[PDB]
Design a protein around this ligand. Structure first.
Ligand code: FAD
Ligand code: FAD
Lengths: 400, 400
């Protein structure tokens, strides 16, 4: 940890990182460069309560645990020179650094077949994106979602609640193909279908003409707005140009180190080891952004601290479904705890591999999720009849 | 480049690297740690002329362009401490380093279903492996090859020439699924079948009993020896233990830098950018080991030198087939230059992507291969009728 510290990006990973630097006792300069001209804010509300209620002053991040930080908002870092240890800014200034931290996140993938569309086509990543989409969620209008991911499904639920007709086109046979158990994905489709979403599986968009989207089965879907949500691409251009190892994401180890000395990376922009799979992956979650930011900062201030070691998890709020998913989507066994039903949905899934818990899901059961995450953390091998047995107190198991 | 230099591994990548350090003018200490108690040697002969003729003094690497190097042969590096800048050796000694270079290669994957086999089961990586296999290539004996890769096919050809019966089990529908055009793979199967190889596609080994191998179609293949060749796994254990970013291979950038300052990696052990695909891959070729070693050394001595930038290629010698393959196996177009025939085989394939050459293959035509590699290097977009037209002088095109 060499002063001064410069962080590129002012999202959750950056804020979490700089707050932890201060909390851990680093007192040198910290400067954060953020391209959005917005008080730093959290993204999960954008497809949830913000999309529904519109108050950005409810979604700001707390920068108070990060005192003495200069935030350069509305400024783009255009390049860095890792030999000279400088960053070039879009406003004409240059920042020196002792330690540079790349926390530039990821951007929605564009859909090539809708390039040159002459109807509204949006993606949902930023506060600006959310305001734009919300401005078009007119009651009785028609929205088409492209993609099977959670964000689009959250938007679908929000739109249905607002009286918007919703169709959805998914290239795969199931929703939430990324990091979600099939049992959950199947149930989620049943839920959305019951709420009036017109779901089209194993279909791809081939183009659009005069307000109508074309599909690869030779059919058409008319819509007033398309929201594309087919995933994101790491914002790793500065790293690539500067000679760091990257491949849709900046490769980092558990200390957040890139292949360039004195340059670290955090959050959505990184490709990193998933300890459960033992494979490198680009993790796309709120918990990773916060936890990785904190762990990297902690180890920078105190090199005796362990590297980042938290296991993955996320949540999604889709209408009546409060979904929580931890670890791996599958193993060699799933245990279903409770009944899977559209009538007052409430259930828990546990994924095991040779008796060891490797993942869990809770739908409308936050109380189960925390002890399951602890059991997951230590690779617990509990009695499987009991795991299924409704009589079982999971918090007790975790404590033991 | 901080002295002293320590290199772990004494294969081609290591030898190429240390020779280039010396040629570029570095005069500080160089120590190489090699676990094999063998004068450094090249691997391609092991499934080719060595397997056929057995003289190891024809396969040694030239270490003369690497003067003043201490080679610690028959010694295993057990760990390194990147803070203390030391390496712990199996003989009880410790080496200090200013710059550490990991060139530890890769080892054959074991076949889980043949663990506990009570018949000879070998892999083919080392001089020791080759001598062991050769000692069992008795005329009229039966050899089973598991895997569709080039090394097993080279062994198959060598064995057939020696009068050994050969069967081969391939899990995929084609041979050489890795980095070989389908047109080449199909022809190669026809060639081996014509030479008496018993080829079994889309079959996997499920086990073995009393000298007989079991397949997933419920059938059996008796053999006197099994040689498993289903690929290799990077020898990245020291890197993993020391906290470097790895995933079946040590991630490096074009300068050979790992995520740990002062630690570099080269050769088969690395996962690195393929410039043609723009994706990270573990390259498994002789040309990469030599070229990457040279480029990394050059840039260490002269930081103004470019990073590693060579495009991939390899060759394979399979009986009457002298195969050369460069670049990508496929694009959006293949041009076939010549006829594809078992009667005096000689042809060239060119792979294009939107008119740009992205790969090439020559079978028994070394003269075509060099100019094609040059056209590939600059992403040439030549006239495609001419590329197909037999009248065409490719060397002239390259020069122009
Ligand atoms: C709509 C939506 C809903 C979500 N819901 C959930 C959820 O319920 N649960 C969950 O687990 N996760 C959710 N996520 C995911 C989560 O929010 C992300 O994982 C998180 O935002 C990643 O934080 P980050 O700081 O790494 O990246 P970002 O939030 O993308 O922040 C990076 C910032 O850096 C900026 N930047 C990029 N390049 C430059 C540059 N050259 N110069 C200056 N600035 C630059 C970016 O524009 C951006 O402002 C959601 C995301 C979205 C978009
Ligand atoms: C049979 C065979 C045929 C081949 N034919 C061809 C061909 O025709 N064309 C082609 O393009 N490529 C071919 N190859 C591939 C090629 O030879 C490899 O790409 C090349 O050997 C890689 O070189 P390397 O130095 O990175 O690794 P290696 O050659 O594997 O050298 C690494 C060395 O480091 C040692 N080591 C590992 N760990 C330690 C440790 N902890 N301490 C000390 N030493 C350690 C290893 O045991 C090994 O001796 C062939 C390979 C084989 C095995």
């Amino acid at each position: 940890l060499k002063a001064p510290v410069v962080v590129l990006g002012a999202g959750l990973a950056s804020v979490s990182f700089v707050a932890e630097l201060r909390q851990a006792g680093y007192q040198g300069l910290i400067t954060v460069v953020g391209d959005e001209a917005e008080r730093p804010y959290d993204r999960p509300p954008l497809s949830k309560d913000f999309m529904a209620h519109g108050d950005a002053e409810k979604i700001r991040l707390d920068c108070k645990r990060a005192p003495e930080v200069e935030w350069l908002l509305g400024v783009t870092a255009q390049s860095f020179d890792p030999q000279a240890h400088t960053v070039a800014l879009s406003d004409g200034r240059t920042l020196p650094y002792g330690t540079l931290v790349l926390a530039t996140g990821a951007a929605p993938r564009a859909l090539p077949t809708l390039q040159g569309a002459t109807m509204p086509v949006h993606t949902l990543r930023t506060l600006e994106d959310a305001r734009r989409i919300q401005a078009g969620l007119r009651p009785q209008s028609r929205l088409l979602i492209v993609g099977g991911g959670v964000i689009g499904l959250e938007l679908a639920a929000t739109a249905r609640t607002a009286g918007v007709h919703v169709s959805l086109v998914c290239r795969g046979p199931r929703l939430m193909s990324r990091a979600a158990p099939a049992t959950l994905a199947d149930f989620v489709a049943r839920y959305h279908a019951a709420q009036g979403v017109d779901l089209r599986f194993e279909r791809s968009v081939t183009g659009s003409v005069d307000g109508v989207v074309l599909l690869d089965d030779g059919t058409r879907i008319a819509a007033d707005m398309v929201v594309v949500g087919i995933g994101v691409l790491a914002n790793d251009a500065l790293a690539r140009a500067a000679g760091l190892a990257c491949d849709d994401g900046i490769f980092v180890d558990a200390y957040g180190r890139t292949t360039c000395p004195d340059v670290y990376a955090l959050g959505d922009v990184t490709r990193q080891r998933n300890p459960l799979s033992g494979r490198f992956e680009r993790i796309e979650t709120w918990s990773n952004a916060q936890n990785q930011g904190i762990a990297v900062a902690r180890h920078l201030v105190d090199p005796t601290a362990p590297g980042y070691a938290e296991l993955p998890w996320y949540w999604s709020d889709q209408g009546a479904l409060r979904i929580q998913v931890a670890g791996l989507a599958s193993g060699d066994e799933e245990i279903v705890r409770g009944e899977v039903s559209l009538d007052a949905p409430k259930f828990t899934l546990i994924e095991l591999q040779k008796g060891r818990i490797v993942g869990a899901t809770c739908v409308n059961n936050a109380r189960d999720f925390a002890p399951l995450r602890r059991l997951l953390a230590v690779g617990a091998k509990p009695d499987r009849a009991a795991l299924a047995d409704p009589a079982t107190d999971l918090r007790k198991l975790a404590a033991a």
